[PDB]
Amino acid sequence: CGRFFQKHQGTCFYFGELPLSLAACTKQWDVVTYLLENPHQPASLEATDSLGNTVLHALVMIADNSPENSALVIHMYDSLLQMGARLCPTVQLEDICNHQGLTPLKLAAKEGKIEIFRHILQREFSGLYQPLSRKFTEWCYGPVRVSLYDLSSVDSWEKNSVLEIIAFHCKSPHRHRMVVLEPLNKLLQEKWDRLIPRFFFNFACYLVYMIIFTIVAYHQPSTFGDSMLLLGHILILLGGIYLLLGQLWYFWRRRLFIWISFMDSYFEILFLVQALLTVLSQVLRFVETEWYLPLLVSSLVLGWLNLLYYTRGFQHTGIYSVMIFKVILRDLLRFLLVYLVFLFGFAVALVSLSREARPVPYGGILDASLELFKFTIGMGELAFQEQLRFRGVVLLLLLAYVLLTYVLLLNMLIALMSETVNSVATDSWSIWKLQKAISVLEMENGYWWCRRKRHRAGRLLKVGTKGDGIPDERWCFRVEEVNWAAWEKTL
Amino acid sequence: QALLTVLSQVLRFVETEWYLPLLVSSLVLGWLNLLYYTRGFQHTGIYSVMIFKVILRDLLRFLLVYLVFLFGFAVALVSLSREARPVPYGGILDASLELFKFTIGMGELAFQEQLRFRGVVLLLLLAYVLLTYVLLLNMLIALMSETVNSVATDSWSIWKLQKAIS
Amino acid sequence: CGRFFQKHQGTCFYFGELPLSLAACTKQWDVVTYLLENPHQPASLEATDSLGNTVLHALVMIADNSPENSALVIHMYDSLLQMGARLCPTVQLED
Description:
The structure is cut from a larger assembly and holds 3 copies of chain A.
Chain A: H1 19-25, H2 29-36, H3 55-61, H4 67-87, H5 104-111, H6 114-121, E1 135-141, E2 144-150, H7 162-168, H8 185-218, H9 224-253, H10 268-286, H11 292-305, H12 315-331, H13 333-352, H14 365-377, H15 391-444, E3 459-462, E4 473-482
Antiparallel strand pairs in A: 1-2, 2-4, 3-4
Helix pairs in contact in A: 1-3, 3-5, 5-7, 7-15, 8-9, 8-11, 8-15, 9-10, 10-11, 12-15, 13-14, 13-15
């Protein structure tokens, strides 16, 4: 338990602070072999350290995405698994919870170790050491194969599953590439196909709420109509309260999620803001404040913008929205910053001049800023003001500003957007896949008022006996695939 | 086009005032149908295929997002601007037309001093312009560039198939 | 004429529902060769199934655009054509 043997920032090398774990991590199979059957006093294999990790946890914690480390980690993991089957076949090493209640597979999911994650997820062995495998094979008639992936600790039916960890606990940058594999892409596709009606019913309900909002906002003064207006207002208030409660429940359930990934969801914040604004305007109406009208319409726009959430039900528009947000985040704030600096400088310069006559344009800073913005909009008034005494200077200043920020900057913006789109397309597809996964996981959990029953995925199938007694039964996920190349390597 | 032409011609004898629209509605279509007879050449023939690929791939998304943004902002502007301290944004059609003027390059971005919510209206207009003109229209050009680069060769093959069918 | 041997959506593998077609599709040239000249009672080569397909129709119906399947299909097609020329040169299998 030394400072150098812990995992932190600076000089360190975490290896499980255990001699067996050290030997396994430094790729010393002879040392491990000698340590496992020393006749003097045997060494254990499910021994834990202070952090709670075991040898497999240490192996997955030292793993990296480089091929050289991944191969070593995979080989050591498999060898240790089969050796544990040799020595202690009763206990299972894969189900040893950490001090945080994490298994090696769940630790791989949380820490972002993609290679070992996929290997553990779809590992396949032979007749010997068969029970400790994840991908089985039911039957092979000709060139078609049926694969049965184990759904242990990965199906969403369990409280803390791999999917939930990936979607809400992993803080790795590129965690969207993680769920785009074999036994994850299919399962989520099936879940999405089953949950389509609920998703589109939610979209329809939101559309109806927004239509009611628009009707109420459009038909409002400074009888039967009065009763209908009051009814519209009370339904708006109820909808705002409902959305506010839902968003508060979401944020309470995902407290440590905002500081994990801020730009992955980025719609729950907008929905919360819209609901808060709607409620505030509705309660401010009874106060008889003139500032009712702004906030209310400030809600309306947001609500319509929130229809852009419900557009990832389709690949085409869903990828379009992700690309839009990537462009905004990557190559629009720079242009805005440079633009604002140039515009403010030139506007202040123009206002400083043009007041020495030989109504008055560029009277204030706001007017000059608006005129310069008219220039990018395509309505700039580029005249030769003959009233003032500095005609030439003002004209040259305007020409320089136009040439600097319109010919150059706006077209460079289009060039940057083209480069961004070309760079991002595929990662955008993967991000859309992750967005669909998150939406599915949220939809499986019911609303804050109604809880949805958890429908277990997969099916119980005979996957052979254990090495002790009563035959082993487990929930598997079935996927058929037609292969002509792999079918050649078995004849 | 043929159905419209026949319907207008038979509606002329009925002495209906709605003769003039349908007839001219035929005319435009007919001229657009000259774009069929342009695959007799590789250059223009491939150009037409690329045009249709761009329309089908990266114009409906932009139109959908545009329509949502425009309708939302137009309804918001009409809801305001009626509390005075003729009248702009009188109806939904007028506000929609003004916002479309913005993408066309003729948007009137003034500081309405008559109404009491000058700042709110100005900020709403500025936000709409920044959102749908600086961003969306240029992203459309970027998407079109990507589409053209992706489709060129398949467009050549599609032109070959079109010639075969002809 | 089973539900699994027909071509539809779900679990299935269409192979022409004929033993000769099955042997040709599973890349078993020795089985095909033995079936074509068994002295007890000869097997036919222009024999059809319920769908109306023959062994060549089955081969082209199982074909895929992957290189591994395409090579197998091409080789089996050519071998069956020349074998039919050997056995029955009068009738043409391509028509």
